[PDB]
Structure formats: C-alpha cells, structure tokens
Amino acid sequence: ALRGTVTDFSGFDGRADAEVLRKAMKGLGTDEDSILNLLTARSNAQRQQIAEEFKTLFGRDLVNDMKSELTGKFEKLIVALMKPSRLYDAYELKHALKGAGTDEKVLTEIIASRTPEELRAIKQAYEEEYGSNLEDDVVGDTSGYYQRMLVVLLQANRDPDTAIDDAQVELDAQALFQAGELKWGTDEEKFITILGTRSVSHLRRVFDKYMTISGFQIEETIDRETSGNLENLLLAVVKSIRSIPAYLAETLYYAMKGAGTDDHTLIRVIVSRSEIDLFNIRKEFRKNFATSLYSMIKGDTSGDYKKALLLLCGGEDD
Amino acid sequence: ALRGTVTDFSGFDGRADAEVLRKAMKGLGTDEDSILNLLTARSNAQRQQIAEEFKTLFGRDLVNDMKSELTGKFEKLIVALMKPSRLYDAYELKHALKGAGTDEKVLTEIIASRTPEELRAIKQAYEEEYGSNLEDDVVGDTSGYYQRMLVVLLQANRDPDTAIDDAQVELDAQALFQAGELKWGTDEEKFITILGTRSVSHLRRVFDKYMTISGFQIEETIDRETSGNLENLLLAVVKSIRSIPAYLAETLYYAMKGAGTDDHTLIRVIVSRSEIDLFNIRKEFRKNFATSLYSMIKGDTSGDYKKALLLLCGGEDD
Amino acid sequence: ALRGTVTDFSGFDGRADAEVLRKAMKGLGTDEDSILNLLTARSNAQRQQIAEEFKTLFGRDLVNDMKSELTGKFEKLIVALMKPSRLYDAYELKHALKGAGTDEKVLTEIIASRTPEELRAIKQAYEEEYGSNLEDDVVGDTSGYYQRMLVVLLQANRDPDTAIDDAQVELDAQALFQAGELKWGTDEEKFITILGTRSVSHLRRVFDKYMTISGFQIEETIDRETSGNLENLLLAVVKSIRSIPAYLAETLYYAMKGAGTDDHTLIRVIVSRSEIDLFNIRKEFRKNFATSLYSMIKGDTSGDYKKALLLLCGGEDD
Numbered sequence: 001a002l003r004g005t006v007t008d009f010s011g012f013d014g015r016a017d018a019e020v021l022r023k024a025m026k027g028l029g030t031d032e033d034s035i036l037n038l039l040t041a042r043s044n045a046q047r048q049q050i051a052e053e054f055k056t057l058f059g060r061d062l063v064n065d066m067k068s069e070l071t072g073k074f075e076k077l078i079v080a081l082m083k084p085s086r087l088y089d090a091y092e093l094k095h096a097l098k099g100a101g102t103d104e105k106v107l108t109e110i111i112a113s114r115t116p117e118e119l120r121a122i123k124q125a126y127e128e129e130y131g132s133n134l135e136d137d138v139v140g141d142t143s144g145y146y147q148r149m150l151v152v153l154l155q156a157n158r159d160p161d162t163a164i165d166d167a168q169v170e171l172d173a174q175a176l177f178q179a180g181e182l183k184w185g186t187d188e189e190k191f192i193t194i195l196g197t198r199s200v201s202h203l204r205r206v207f208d209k210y211m212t213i214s215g216f217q218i219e220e221t222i223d224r225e226t227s228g229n230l231e232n233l234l235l236a237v238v239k240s241i242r243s244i245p246a247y248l249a250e251t252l253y254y255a256m257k258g259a260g261t262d263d264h265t266l267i268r269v270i271v272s273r274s275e276i277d278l279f280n281i282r283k284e285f286r287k288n289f290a291t292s293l294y295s296m297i298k299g300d301t302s303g304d305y306k307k308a309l310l311l312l313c314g315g316e317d318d
Numbered sequence: 319a320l321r322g323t324v325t326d327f328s329g330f331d332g333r334a335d336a337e338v339l340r341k342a343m344k345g346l347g348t349d350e351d352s353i354l355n356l357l358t359a360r361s362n363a364q365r366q367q368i369a370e371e372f373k374t375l376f377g378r379d380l381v382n383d384m385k386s387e388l389t390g391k392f393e394k395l396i397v398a399l400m401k402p403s404r405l406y407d408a409y410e411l412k413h414a415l416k417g418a419g420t421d422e423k424v425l426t427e428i429i430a431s432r433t434p435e436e437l438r439a440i441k442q443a444y445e446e447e448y449g450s451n452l453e454d455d456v457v458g459d460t461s462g463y464y465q466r467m468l469v470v471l472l473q474a475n476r477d478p479d480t481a482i483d484d485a486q487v488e489l490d491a492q493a494l495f496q497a498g499e500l501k502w503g504t505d506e507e508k509f510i511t512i513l514g515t516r517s518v519s520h521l522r523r524v525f526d527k528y529m530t531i532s533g534f535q536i537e538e539t540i541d542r543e544t545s546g547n548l549e550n551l552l553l554a555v556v557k558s559i560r561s562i563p564a565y566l567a568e569t570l571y572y573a574m575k576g577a578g579t580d581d582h583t584l585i586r587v588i589v590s591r592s593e594i595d596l597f598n599i600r601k602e603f604r605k606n607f608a609t610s611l612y613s614m615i616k617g618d619t620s621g622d623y624k625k626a627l628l629l630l631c632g633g634e635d636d
Numbered sequence: 637a638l639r640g641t642v643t644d645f646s647g648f649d650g651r652a653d654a655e656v657l658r659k660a661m662k663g664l665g666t667d668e669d670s671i672l673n674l675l676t677a678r679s680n681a682q683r684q685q686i687a688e689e690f691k692t693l694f695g696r697d698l699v700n701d702m703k704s705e706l707t708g709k710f711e712k713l714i715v716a717l718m719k720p721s722r723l724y725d726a727y728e729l730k731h732a733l734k735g736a737g738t739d740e741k742v743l744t745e746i747i748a749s750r751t752p753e754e755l756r757a758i759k760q761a762y763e764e765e766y767g768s769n770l771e772d773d774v775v776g777d778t779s780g781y782y783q784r785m786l787v788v789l790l791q792a793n794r795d796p797d798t799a800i801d802d803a804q805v806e807l808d809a810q811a812l813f814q815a816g817e818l819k820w821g822t823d824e825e826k827f828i829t830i831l832g833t834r835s836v837s838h839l840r841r842v843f844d845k846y847m848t849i850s851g852f853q854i855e856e857t858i859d860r861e862t863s864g865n866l867e868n869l870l871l872a873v874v875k876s877i878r879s880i881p882a883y884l885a886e887t888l889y890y891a892m893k894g895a896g897t898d899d900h901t902l903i904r905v906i907v908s909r910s911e912i913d914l915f916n917i918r919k920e921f922r923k924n925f926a927t928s929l930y931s932m933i934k935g936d937t938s939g940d941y942k943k944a945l946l947l948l949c950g951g952e953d954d
C-alpha cells in the first residue's frame with residue numbers, strides 16, 4: 001500500500017542533467033526555475049549520480065555550488081533534497097542534538113515514526129558519518145522517562161508481528177489500566193515496556209480493548225497521566241502504531257497551522273517521506289483535515305520554495 | 319583437556335533474567351544476593367544478551383545501573399564479569415598502559431600466557447575499542463629487552479607444533495647454555511629469539527635437554543643471568559610453555575599469599591579464565607599448593623565479593 | 637609491454653634476510669653495503685615480509701632501526717623502498733599537502749600520471765592511513781582551474797577505451813580549437829572536460845586531428861593559452877596520455893638537469909615505478925635524451941645513495 005510521490009525518471013541521463021545545472025548557475029545570477037524543475041523530477045539516487053557527473057565534468061562540488069548560488073528556505077530545501085536518503089534522518093537527528101538546546105520535537109518525530117528496520121540503518125549511518133554512537137548522544141542530551149523510552153525505541157527490538165493471542169491482549173490492556181488510571185501517580189515503566197516493545201499488530205488490538213475496558217482512548221489516558229516531553233513521545237508512538245502516514249500528516253498540519261510556518265518540519269517531512277509514503281500522507285491529510293496538503297502548502301509558502309514543495313507533493317485534486 | 323568452570327545455563331530466558339535484575343536494584347537499597355546468584359550462573363555470552371534485554375525492556379544500561387548500586391570489590395568483580403570476553407584482556411592491557419606508572423605485571427601475565435590465536439584476537443579488539451595499535455602503546459611505555467620480548471610475543475608468530483627434530487633440540491639447548499651460563503654477561507637476543515619464537519612442543523624438549531647438559535633448570539639460569547622486568551617475563555614465558563594453567567595457578571597463589579590480597583589479579587584471573595581453563599587451574603593449584611583454590615579464596619576474601627568468587631570457582635572438595 | 641626493473645627474488649628466505657640486516661646494524665657502525673645490496677634485490681612485497689620476520693626474531697622495528705643507523709639521501713631512499721607499494725603514492729601526496737607551502741609539482745606529477753585504477757586505490761589507502769579524504773585535502777590547498785582539473789582527475793572516471801568514433805574526434809578537436817586559439821581569452825572549462833574525461837585512445841586521435849586542423853600541437857596551444865600551475869598540469873595530462881613512461885622519463889631528466897639534483901623527485905620516480913614500468917621509462921629516456929638513465933644518475937649522485945639507485949635502475953648498456 002505504501003507509495004511515495006517521487007520515483008526514478010525514465011530515460012535519465014546524469015551527464016545531460018549535470019550540464020543543465022551548470023548552465024543554470026554559470027556566470028551572473030541563477031536560474032532557480034531550471035534547478036527546481038530538474039531536481040524535484042529525479043529520485044534521490046538519481047540526484048547522487050547527477051552530483052558525481054557534475055564533479056567529473058567540471059571538478060566542482062554540486063551542493064557547494066548550490067549553497068553559493070541559492071538562498072533562504074529554497075536553499076534549505078534543495079540541500080535537504082541532495083542529502084543521500086540513507087543519511088538524511090541521521091543528519092536531522094545529529095542537528096537536533098545540542099545540549100539543553102536540544103530539539104526534542106525532532107528526536108520524538110523521527111524515533112517514534114521510523115520502523116525498527118529504519119532505525120537499525122539510521123544508527124549505522126549516524127556512527128559512520130559522525131564517529132559517535134546515536135544512543136550515547138541521545139542519552140547525553142535527554143533525561144528521565146523521556147530518555148528511557150527513546151533508548152527502548154532505539155534498540156529496534158520491537159516484537160515481530162505474529163498471530164494475536166487474545167489473552168495477552170486482555171492482560172496488556174488491563175496492565176495499562178492498572179498502571180495509569182487506577183494508580184495514584186503513574187507506573188511509567190509499564191507503559192514504556194508495553195508501548196515500546198510489543199508488536200504493532202498486538203498493540204492495535206490492545207488499544208481497542210483498553211477503550212472497551214476503561215472508556216478512554218489510550219491517547220486520552222496519556223494526556224491525563226503524563227505531561228511534557230514524555231507525553232509528546234508517548235502520543236507520537238501511539239499515533240505511529242495506529243498509522244505512520246496519519247501521524248506524519250498530523251505533524252505537517254500543525255507545522256502550517258497558526259501564524260507562519262514551521263519550515264524545518266515541513267521540509268523534513270516532505271523530503272524524508274517523498275520516496276516512501278508521502279502519497280499515503282496526502283490521503284490521510286485530506287481525509288482528516290478536509291483540505292489538500294497541496295492547498296495548505298500553497299497558502300503557507302512563497303516563491304521558488306513554494307514551487308519546489310508543490311512539485312514534490314503533487315495532489316492538486318486530492 | 320581444557321575446561322572452564324562457567325558454562326551456558328540450560329533453559330536461559332534473557333528477558334526473565336533482566337526482570338529479576340531490575341527488581342534487585344529498583345527502589346531503595348539493592349539485593350546483591352539476587353544479582354551475584356544470577357550472573358555467576360550465566361555464561362559471558364548470556365550476560366551480554368541479558369544486558370540487551372534489560373535495555374530493551376527498561377531503556378536503562380544494565381552495567382551503568384550496577385555501577386550505581388554496587389560498591390567496592392564486589393562492584394569491580396561484577397563489572398569485570400559483564401565485559402564481553404572478546405574485549406576483557408584488551409581492557410586489562412589498556413588499563414595497564416599509563417606512562418612510567420605502567421603496570422608491568424599485567425603486561426607480562428597476559429602477553430606471556432595467551433596463545434598466538436588469543437593475541438591476534440586481542441590486538442584486533444584493542445584497536446577497534448581504543449583506536450590505537452597495542453604494539454605501539456606497549457613500545458611507548460616499555461624499554462629495553464623487556465620491550466623487545468613483549469614485541470616478539472605480540473607478533474603472535476610462534477612456530478607451529480610439528481614433528482620434533484632431535485638435532486634442533488640439541489642445537490637450541492646448547493645455544494642457550496652458550497648465551498647465558500658460559501658467557502660473561504648474557505646474550506639476551508638469543509634467549510628472546512629461542513623462547514619467543516620456537517614452538518611450544520619443541521621448547522618443552524629444549525628445557526629437558528638444557529637441564530641434562532647444564533645441570534640447571536632453565537628457570538634457574540634465568541634467575542642467575544637476568545633481573546627485573548625481563549626476568550619476570552622470561553620466567554612467565556617458560557612457565558606458560560610448560561603449562562598455562564600451572565602458571566596461572568601460581569599467579570593466583572601469589573596474589574593471595576602474604577598480608578591482604580592482590581584483588582585486581584584475583585579478579586582478572588578468575589574472570590578471564592572462567593570459560594577456558596579455570597578448572598585446570600584449580601587442579602594444578604591443588605596439586606602444587608596442597609590446598610584448594612576455593613579454601614584460599616574463602617580465607618582471603620569477604621562479603622558478597624567472596625560469595626561471587628566462590629560460585630565462579632567451584633571446587634569445594636578439590 | 638609494461639615492465640619494472642625489480643622482481644621477486646627466487647629462493648627468498650625472509651628470516652635469513654632479517655638476520656643479515658640485523659648483523660649489518662648490530663653494534664658499532666653500520667654495513668650500508670650489505671643493506672643496499674639486499675633490499676634493492678628484493679621486491680616490495682618481500683621487503684614487507686623481511687620487516688615482519690625482523691620484528692618476530694628481534695622485537696625491533698626494521699625501518700625505525702634503519703632510520704637510526706642511516707643518514708642523508710641514502711636514508712631517504714631506503715625508507716622510501718620500505719614503504720608498502722600500496723601506500724607510497726598516498727604518502728607522497730600527504731607530504732605534498734601543507735597550506736600555501738603545498739608542493740604542486742608532486743600533486744601534478746602523481747595525479748596526471750596515475751591511471752583511474754591506480755587513483756581509486758590511492759584514494760582508499762590515503763583515507764585509511766590518514767583519516768582524511770584526499771579530494772577534501774587537495775581542494776583545501778589548491779584554487780582555481782588547477783584545483784578543478786585535479787578534482788576531475790581524482791574522480792577516476794575517465795571514459796573507457798572503446799571503438800573510436802571519427803566524428804567525435806573531429807568534434808572534440810574543433811571544440812578545443814574554438815576554446816583556445818580562436819577565443820579571446822580561454823574556455824578552460826572545455827579543455828578540462830575534454831582532457832580530463834575522454835578516453836586515452838580517443839584523446840590520442842584528438843591530438844593528431846587538432847595538429848591537422850590548427851597547425852599547432854596541443855602542447856603548443858597550452859603554452860600559448862595558459863600559464864602557471866594549470867599550464868603544468870595540462871601539459872602533464874597531455875604527455876601522460878601520449879605515454880606515461882615518456883612523461884616520467886622527462887620528469888627524471890629535468891630533476892637531474894642543471895646544477896645539483898632534485899633528489900626528492902629522483903627517489904619518488906625510481907621507487908614508485910620500479911615494479912611497474914621503470915624499464916619502459918629507461919627506454920624512453922634513452923630514445924629521447926640520447927643518454928642512459930644509468931649514466932645520468934651515475935654522474936649526478938654520490939656514495940651509497942648512488943650505488944642503491946644504480947642497482948634499482950639497471951641499464952648500464954641502454
């Protein structure tokens with residue numbers, strides 16, 4: 001079911017593309033339109049080959065040249081598009097990690113929404129790129145049950161999806177009820193073990209049974225029982241278990257709701273998911289907010305940045 | 319013939335074990351008894367899996383938590399037990415290497431008693447763990463013929479055991495006689511080449527022939543001809559060629575002989591050899607010192623430390 | 637057709653060799669003659685095995701000992717001979733790279749004359765040895781079109797030799813004519829793309845056609861149109877396309893022409909090419925300068941340095 005919005009261009013000629021891009025920047029000024037039309041129409045792997053052909057022909061670094069010619073949010077988007085897909089989540093995490101100035105929204109968004117297979121790949125790329133252990137750095141800049149839940153998720157050890165055992169569903173739903181609503185205070189450890197390690201298909205059934213038993217959705221309990229960064233993370237984990245595309249659609253919605261735009265979040269989501277499930281994200285977005293992702297981006301963004309974003313997204317008639 | 323005292327626990331459940339350990343430390347105080355009974359009854363590989371399950375369930379680092387809860391020599395022993403077997407000798411060497419403050423006893427003990435196959439593995443683990451070349455660091459903190467002999471041994475290039483050539487045995491025994499007892503001064507280079515590079519089975523025959531020719535055991539010549547760190551190393555090499563378990567039994571004996579205990583040596587030997595030849599060490603110990611290793615540990619050690627050591631050793635009725 | 641002047645010694649005994657070398661340095665003074673006669677008569681791989689046997693027997697580092705005993709240009713040559721072949725070009729490049737004090741002659745000589753297969757191997761060895769990216773370091777210490785051409789060559793992406801297309805030969809020869817002689821100023825980008833990326837066999841035909849069209853050899857155009865480091869690099873690239881051995885023969889010729897000797901260049905060329913094409917270099921040298929490489933070295937060099945160089949070169953009767 002999972003589909004992105006960007007695929008390999010048929011009849012790709014990396015050398016031709018590199019020439020077009022050189023022409024766009026060569027000499028006075030910059031043809032931003034030529035740049036954005038080309039790069040939004042090539043897959044990430046294809047952008048890498050363009051970069052290598054550009055360096056072969058001209059002995060210039062393509063990204064460095066674009067960083068020189070381009071400006072503002074447009075530049076930020078183009079540089080994000082050029083990052084190899086295998087490194088992008090790691091790069092975003094690395095840039096989130098910076099002392100008490102750490103960007104917890106980013107840690108939560110990525111770590112909650114990436115699959116165990118994705119996280120294994122992220123941990124490897126991060127260590128190779130930056131010479132540090134991701135878990136160590138996360139532990140360094142976080143504290144409390146928030147850190148613990150992140151470490152649990154970073155183990156990428158979630159139970160595999162297997163046949164559902166109804167008695168285990170009952171036991172876990174009851175455990176959660178006893179650990180939160182029936183407890184003075186909260187047994188956070190219990191929530192973390194169950195939400196962090198049980199399989200996705202098992203937890204979906206647990207969530208339904210928990211509603212049946214308690215009269216609350218698990219998200220309602222979480223808001224009633226916790227707060228702060230732990231609350232945001234537990235909500236992101238639950239929402240991701242229910243539907244990753246739905247959680248990411250919501251993330252996009254809130255980046256553009258209110259005054260201005262959370263541009264960093266907008267760029268990160270669109271670029272990171274453009275070859276995975278951005279199509280599914282569009283669908284969830286239109287189902288849940290009765291408005292196209294396209295029309296919300298169109299209304300929230302300006303100039304070449306807007307143009308490039310809309311080309312990546314598609315879905316005018318969503 | 320080689321047997322350790324610790325083996326894989328049958329019916330191992332890493333998750334269950336992790337829960338037991340969490341219960342032991344959770345909240346006020348610490349159940350040291352639960353900790354030592356469990357960990358001494360699991361193999362090193364099994365301890366690693368427990369650590370991974372603990373982190374998966376609770377998002378806590380098991381060793382860090384134990385370092386927080388435990389104290390003293392007991393803590394030192396538990397942390398030593400948790401070090402992956404493939405890294406432990408490298409860790410001990412790294413910790414021995416520290417300027418003119420270097421711990422030569424440790425360099426000698428490990429490098430003399432480990433097989434060429436073990437040393438190849440140690441050199442690799444050390445470089446991977448610490449980003450340094452073991453040989454370079456040894457050379458950095460040692461001097462003289464002591465350093466040279468260590469470098470020779472670090473090459474892990476000892477002749478393989480093959481059919482014994484009686485004439486070569488005669489030649490080497492005579493060479494040794496001429497290089498030491500018949501020489502004004504000592505040709506250390508000759509001792510180092512022969513002791514450092516000839517095969518174990520060849521040198522065992524050389525030692526017997528040397529006694530026949532000279533009327534001295536090679537160990538007696540070494541004490542007569544050399545002194546200081548070179549003497550200790552040459553003795554350790556000879557004793558290891560004769561019997562590694564016997565050399566390690568002697569090492570343990572002297573750690574506990576006299577006032578107090580060399581606890582660092584006691585922990586290192588017991589832990590490092592617990593899955594290789596600690597059973598053989600016990601046997602040599604009882605043969606050579608007419609007393610059980612168990613009874614000597616029992617008499618020399620206190621509290622939870624004593625309990626854990628005795629469980630690892632076994633051999634009450636040795 | 638490609639032949640070196642040094643090959644594997646038949647009946648090689650690394651242990652025997654190590655003993656000879658130890659004897660040469662042991663005690664007061666040094667037997668330089670024994671050292672140079674042996675090492676010039678062993679291949680690079682064989683020198684590595686000698687070094688390992690020396691360390692195994694004596695626990696001494698062979699190169700460190702030679703650095704201690706030897707002096708001057710002789711020492712520099714012996715140390716160069718001991719560097720593993722797979723690391724030598726990388727070592728020379730690393731030593732060329734040092735701020736505005738950078739040795740451009742070395743960057744040009746190596747990068748222009750090494751094949752794409754050789755450069756791939758060099759880039760890998762450099763990163764492994766020094767923890768840095770070669771391209772990054774080159775970019776750091778160079779500027780302008782000189783840097784660009786070096787980066788192009790460092791991509792090691794030259795078109796493969798395939799069937800020649802006469803129309804493409806015409807197009808490229810005309811392109812070059814239009815980019816230089818017919819242009820006010822020079823389109824350096826065009827020269828760099830064509831000279832840097834087209835196949836060797838294609839460019840050889842382009843050079844002939846360019847002469848036919850313009851009445852100039854490409855080297856004459858280069859001198860007419862460019863200057864400085866870019867000129868030297870473009871000439872080295874063209875000369876290498878025509879004949880690597882011929883370019884290296886010329887490089888040697890100029891190292892010894894005039895007062896004194898460029899010893900660093902002499903050592904680098906002889907050692908780096910001794911197992912590849914130094915025989916071909918000798919032949920080109922004798923064809924083009926009507927004098928033996930041997931006789932020029934003999935006349936330009938002194939002492940043990942001279943002796944060792946002449947043994948490596950051969951070709952008294954060239």
Ligand SMILES: [Ca+2]
Pocket residue numbers: 024025026027028029030069
């Ligand atoms: Ca421009």
Ligand SMILES: [Ca+2]
Pocket residue numbers: 029030031032
């Ligand atoms: Ca413009």
Ligand SMILES: [Ca+2]
Pocket residue numbers: 066067068069070071072075
């Ligand atoms: Ca910019």
Ligand SMILES: [Ca+2]
Pocket residue numbers: 179180181182183184185186225
């Ligand atoms: Ca509660």
Ligand SMILES: [Ca+2]
Pocket residue numbers: 222223224225226227228231
């Ligand atoms: Ca709340």
Ligand SMILES: [Ca+2]
Pocket residue numbers: 256257258259260261300
């Ligand atoms: Ca807005």
Ligand SMILES: [Ca+2]
Pocket residue numbers: 342343344345346347348387
């Ligand atoms: Ca506690």
Ligand SMILES: [Ca+2]
Pocket residue numbers: 347348349350
């Ligand atoms: Ca207690």
Ligand SMILES: [Ca+2]
Pocket residue numbers: 384385386387388389390393
């Ligand atoms: Ca402690």
Ligand SMILES: [Ca+2]
Pocket residue numbers: 497498499500501502503504543
């Ligand atoms: Ca003597």
Ligand SMILES: [Ca+2]
Pocket residue numbers: 540541542543544545546549
């Ligand atoms: Ca003595």
Ligand SMILES: [Ca+2]
Pocket residue numbers: 574575576577578579618
């Ligand atoms: Ca004692």
Ligand SMILES: [Ca+2]
Pocket residue numbers: 660661662663664665666705
């Ligand atoms: Ca000497």
Ligand SMILES: [Ca+2]
Pocket residue numbers: 665666667668
């Ligand atoms: Ca001399």
Ligand SMILES: [Ca+2]
Pocket residue numbers: 702703704705706707708711
């Ligand atoms: Ca010297």
Ligand SMILES: [Ca+2]
Pocket residue numbers: 815816817818819820821822861
């Ligand atoms: Ca011109």
